[PDB]
Amino acid sequence: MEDIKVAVVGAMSAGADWRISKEACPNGKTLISTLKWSYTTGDGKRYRSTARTTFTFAKPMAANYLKNQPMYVFRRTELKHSKTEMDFKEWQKAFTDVVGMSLPATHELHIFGSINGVGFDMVGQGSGNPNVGYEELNLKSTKGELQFSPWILVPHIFHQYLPYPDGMSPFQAAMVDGSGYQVHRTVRFEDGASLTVNYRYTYEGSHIKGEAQVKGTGFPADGPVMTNSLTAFHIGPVTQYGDQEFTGAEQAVADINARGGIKGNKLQIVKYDDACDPKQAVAVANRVVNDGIKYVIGHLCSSSAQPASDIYEDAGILMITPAATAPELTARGYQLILRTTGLDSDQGLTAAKYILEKVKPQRIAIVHDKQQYGEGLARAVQGGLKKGNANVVFFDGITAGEKDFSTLVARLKKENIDFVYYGGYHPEMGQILRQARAAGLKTQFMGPEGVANVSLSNIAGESAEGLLVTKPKNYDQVPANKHIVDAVKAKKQDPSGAFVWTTYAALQSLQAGLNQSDDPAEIAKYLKANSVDTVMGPLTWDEKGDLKGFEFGVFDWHANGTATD
Numbered sequence: 001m002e003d004i005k006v007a008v009v010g011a012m013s014a015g016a017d018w019r020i021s022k023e024a025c026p027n028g029k030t031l032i033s034t035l036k037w038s039y040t041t042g043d044g045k046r047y048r049s050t051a052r053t054t055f056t057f058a059k060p061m062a063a064n065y066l067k068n069q070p071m072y073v074f075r076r077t078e079l080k081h082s083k084t085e086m087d088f089k090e091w092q093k094a095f096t097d098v099v100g101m102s103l104p105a106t107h108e109l110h111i112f113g114s115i116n117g118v119g120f121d122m123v124g125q126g127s128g129n130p131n132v133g134y135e136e137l138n139l140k141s142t143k144g145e146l147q148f149s150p151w152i153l154v155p156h157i158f159h160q161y162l163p164y165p166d167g168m169s170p171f172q173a174a175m176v177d178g179s180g181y182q183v184h185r186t187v188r189f190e191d192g193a194s195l196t197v198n199y200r201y202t203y204e205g206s207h208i209k210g211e212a213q214v215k216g217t218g219f220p221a222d223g224p225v226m227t228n229s230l231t232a233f234h235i236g237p238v239t240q241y242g243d244q245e246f247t248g249a250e251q252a253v254a255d256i257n258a259r260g261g262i263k264g265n266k267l268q269i270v271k272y273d274d275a276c277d278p279k280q281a282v283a284v285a286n287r288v289v290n291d292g293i294k295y296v297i298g299h300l301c302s303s304s305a306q307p308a309s310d311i312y313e314d315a316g317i318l319m320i321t322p323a324a325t326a327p328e329l330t331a332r333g334y335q336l337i338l339r340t341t342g343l344d345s346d347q348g349l350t351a352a353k354y355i356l357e358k359v360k361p362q363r364i365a366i367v368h369d370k371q372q373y374g375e376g377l378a379r380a381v382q383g384g385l386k387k388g389n390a391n392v393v394f395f396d397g398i399t400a401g402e403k404d405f406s407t408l409v410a411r412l413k414k415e416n417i418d419f420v421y422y423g424g425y426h427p428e429m430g431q432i433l434r435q436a437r438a439a440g441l442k443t444q445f446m447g448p449e450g451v452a453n454v455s456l457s458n459i460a461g462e463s464a465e466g467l468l469v470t471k472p473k474n475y476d477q478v479p480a481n482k483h484i485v486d487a488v489k490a491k492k493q494d495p496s497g498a499f500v501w502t503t504y505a506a507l508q509s510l511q512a513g514l515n516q517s518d519d520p521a522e523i524a525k526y527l528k529a530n531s532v533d534t535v536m537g538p539l540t541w542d543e544k545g546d547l548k549g550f551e552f553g554v555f556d557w558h559a560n561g562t563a564t565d
């Protein structure tokens with residue numbers, strides 16, 4: 001009768017604005033606060049850290065603070081930084097429940113020590129509002145240029161600026177009486193690295209002097225930290241796909257658990273982020289196993305669902321990908337691996353047919369981005385086009401995430417290309433469509449479900465008009481799915497996305513399974529020999545876990561970010 005844990009594996013999700021510091025006091029003279037903290041890489045990767053932080057009070061804390069077992073503190077931050085300056089702002093709000101809706105005026109921070117034995121030292125002034133939990137800080141180097149990421153000194157760059165619901169925090173209480181606290185903080189990194197910070201404070205009226213002594217060690221030398229690859233989260237090349245999964249998934253789970261759940265037992269999503277990165281997707285998978293989670297919804301890109309699939313199979317963990325389409329993944333005899341989507345093979349053949357039958361252009365160019373998906377899809381299509389005598393002029397590739405297509409654009413122009421197929425994902429396609437119509441090509445473009453999203457429209461504007469896509473059918477127009485569509489809307493979320501539906505269908509799949517056996521093997525056996533009613537229709541699977549008789553369907557794309565037959 002425990003809740004049943006399902007892993008949902010997104011990609012390049014923002015995550016929550018506020019961080020939970022949990023706060024416990026085991027004695028009158030000690031406060032311990034626990035932190036989870038992911039950084040993000042100028043790449044959209046996640047570097048995961050866990051903090052323990054210890055406050056020593058020279059005088060015992062009044063009884064009121066102790067009688068109020070777990071306090072919860074929500075904190076956000078911002079950092080602008082050069083190689084020499086930093087500028088930082090913190091908002092902090094205390095509550096006694098995990099549900100989110102003279103005192104100090106000025107301070108200084110001397111923050112010094114070492115990172116992988118590279119000494120650093122910074123100094124500078126700041127202010128805050130002890131009533132509201134706001135603080136700000138400027139900091140200048142007294143040595144030279146940080147040869148590490150300044151986002152590693154974040155959080156560590158003044159809890160005397162908090163307050164509790166009905167008064168002063170313990171931290172403030174301690175400043176006003178003069179007896180004070182000290183702070184040890186310790187950070188574990190997923191990659192073995194380690195950071196120690198010790199904090200002493202003097203008070204001079206309402207001004208604070210912070211001393212902060214910093215020992216970091218065994219950061220990998222081409223890690224995010226030693227490499228300055230750390231950024232705030234900026235939307236990433238697959239944020240659209242992760243967001244559509246999470247949406248379809250959170251609706252589904254609500255709707256299931258309302259209907260009473262599996263057999264009394266409710267489902268609980270445990271969110272993970274693999275960044276569609278091979279290594280990270282392998283960190284995620286090892287964590288999934290270790291967390292006792294036996295059913296996985298996700299790994300969205302082929303490139304990251306392969307590496308992940310190995311561990312899951314190796315561990316007796318069920319994995320339904322609602323999104324990864326490269327046929328490789330179900331072509332290696334794995335038994336615990338299912339799909340709520342089709343394959344590049346059928347997706348490239350659908351295209352070629354629509355080009356040979358219903359377009360018939362004169363001069364074809366085939367472009368891809370060189371990854372499994374894109375090249376994969378271009379080879380189907382090329383092969384379909386070759387067999388129907390279509391006049392394919394050149395097949396070519398580009399790097400993912402360059403913004404400059406002046407070379408491809410001048411070349412489609414020089415060679416009077418009226419049609420182009422682009423195997424790949426929306427960022428590159430977006431720029432193509434847009435830098436094309438800028439240069440005044442009348443060229444007609446085509447893409448797979450990877451470009452069939454609202455972000456394509458966001459990048460391209462009017463250029464997106466007339467783009468041809470292959471994509472799953474529009475199940476958001478099917479009357480059964482009306483209720484679901486309304487709920488997504490109630491939440492201001494966009495239900496047209498296909499991964500919303502595939503994801504929703506993948507949970508329903510898991511549902512049917514779970515209703516006999518909590519065992520990952522019988523589920524895969526059951527599902528393979530039975531049809532499930534889902535938001536996509538009935539869903540028979542085959543013995544390698546591919547959906548039987550899945551047809552993508554070909555659609556006209558529009559600058560509004562909808563799509564018609």
Ligand SMILES: CC[C@H](C)[C@H](N)C(=O)O
Binds near residue numbers: 324325326449450
């Ligand atoms: C999110 C899925 C992406 C677009 C594609 N189907 C792939 O296998 O990489």
Ligand SMILES: [Cl-]
Binds near residue numbers: 021033053
């Ligand atoms: Cl803290």
